[PDB]
């Protein structure tokens, strides 16, 4: 069997231009466990992004949290890029603030 990842992008605290924060990409509900995740800043891969342990849910499906410290601005555009055997093409989800 195979399951497609679900992808959420959100910040740790309510976003405030100028204030330091963490940006989070939570990928869940997938199988098998091999998955490629990148955060993007103005379209560019961010270099040193941290991630939690690949863990799993009651239904055996995998999940994973990628994060980086960031300071929101009006100008800067963030997103999460995810690749996985079930995806015919890599999937980009944009950070839409407080949504």
């Amino acid at each position: 069997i195979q399951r497609t990842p679900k992808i959420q992008v959100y910040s740790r605290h309510p976003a405030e231009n100028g204030k330091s924060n963490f940006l989070n990409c939570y990928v869940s509900g997938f199988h098998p466990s091999d998955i490629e995740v990148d955060l993007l800043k103005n379209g560019e891969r961010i270099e040193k992004v941290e991630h939690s342990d690949l863990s799993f849910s009651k239904d055996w499906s995998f999940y994973l949290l990628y994060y980086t410290e960031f300071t929101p601005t009006e100008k800067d555009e963030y997103a999460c890029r995810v690749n996985h055997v079930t995806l015919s093409q890599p999937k980009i989800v944009k950070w839409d603030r407080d949504m």
Binding site: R12, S20, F22, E50, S52, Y67, E69
Partner: protein, 583 residues
Amino acid sequence: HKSEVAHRFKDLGEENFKALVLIAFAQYLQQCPFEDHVKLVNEVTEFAKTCVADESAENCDKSLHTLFGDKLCTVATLRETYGEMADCCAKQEPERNECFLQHKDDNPNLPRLVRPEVDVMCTAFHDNEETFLKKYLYEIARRHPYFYAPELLFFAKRYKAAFTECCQAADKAACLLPKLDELRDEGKASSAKQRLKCASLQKFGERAFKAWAVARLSQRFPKAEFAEVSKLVTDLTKVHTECCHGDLLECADDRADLAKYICENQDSISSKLKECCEKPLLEKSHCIAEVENDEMPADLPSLAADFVESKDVCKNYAEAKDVFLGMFLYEYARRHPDYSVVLLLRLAKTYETTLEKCCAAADPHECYAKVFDEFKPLVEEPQNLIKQNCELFEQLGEYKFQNALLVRYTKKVPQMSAPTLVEVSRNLGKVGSKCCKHPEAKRMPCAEDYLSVVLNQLCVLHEKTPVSDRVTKCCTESLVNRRPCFSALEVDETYVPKEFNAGTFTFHADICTLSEKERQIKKQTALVELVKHKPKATKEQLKAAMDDFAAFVEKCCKADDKETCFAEEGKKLVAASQAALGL
């Protein structure tokens, strides 16, 4: 004998037999409730009395292993309470008793032994003396599964004595509490010593223990002939081999026999035993075991003649290597009563390695001629090491000294968890308190003997749950060279450091409600973690990072909203700490 249980009960008598079985049961089943063990002891005792009355009664020829096992497995089958011991009960003898012996827990997860108030103890002692004293045996045996059983009988007698003496003192607390604290400390030392004795037999073989014994006894009994010292060593070795294998009744019985023999052959042994030998059984054996060193026989000829100059050195060595080295150790040890046994054993080893090389040379005499010049540096290295550590202990105080060692050992063994490392540093750190106060000539032998004891405790536990191959190597390579091996370990560079991560850092306000010494253990955990994040960290990088931690705990604990502050100031501490360590 036709009945082993009869024979031991007859030789030991009921009081000691019952006390030893209690000890035995408590050491096999450390988690078992007091009342259950007493029950099992009483039934074994009922069975012993029957066999004494009639040595052909049914089952009286069963081994003591089978009887004790039968009794232990009425409760030890409950895996929920007893864990891997349930596996032992799934087996037949002799495999069963061997399984119990492997599950003796050197780190029992058992509550600290808090005292009641003095009045509650004294009332309990008056109301049921018997039960009060069995609990002492139980509570010590179960926390120290290799405690030397005959000596624990002696400790129990001292514990009784303190209560008998103090419970009607004008100031009961002032009389009693210092006595109980002394016993507690002597018991810990005694247990630690015996554990090292059992480890040397079990993991380094019978000759390792024989060499220790020859050394210590030759210092104690320096006017005895080698033949007499060997006889004593053989009997002492049988005794400890039985005790360390859980065969306590036979152990205590042979020990009484040794004590008796020593006391009937004083003129062959020592001039210091006269008063020891007038005492009752347990005091007698304790006294003989701690008796002061006899005076050395005067104007003794050099070791050069027999161990360097003689033409028969290689021959005598070749036929009987352990015996010949026994003779060396006897002659060296008796002339140096002030030396740690570890040091003496290290010198005998050096001499052994020298003959092994040189007796295969074309000219053995010339090759080993200077063998004694090897010794003086081996005597000085620990002296200097201990002098440096004592000075450091005196300049820093106990808490900072522990901190200095904690940094050292985390660097050496970053694979260990923080609580282990904090315990190891605390125990190593006690070397400063126990030894540095003694005169210079007793500092070094105190330090070296105590450090061997602590490291052995680290080793027997590490063998059960290993985390560093370096520790294993230092634990297994050479018993006598353990301390130097651990001393020579530098920062482990195989270890991949913990990366800093603000996002997973969590610290709550619960430290504020902690005492001074509980809060110090948190600072020590912080230290361990810093080092794991950069093993090569300097003292001054760590000082800075620790200063950030202490300021962070002092800021948020006095803040109005405490939990918010630890939440809020967490990200910056992590950033500051990382900067302090050069990232």
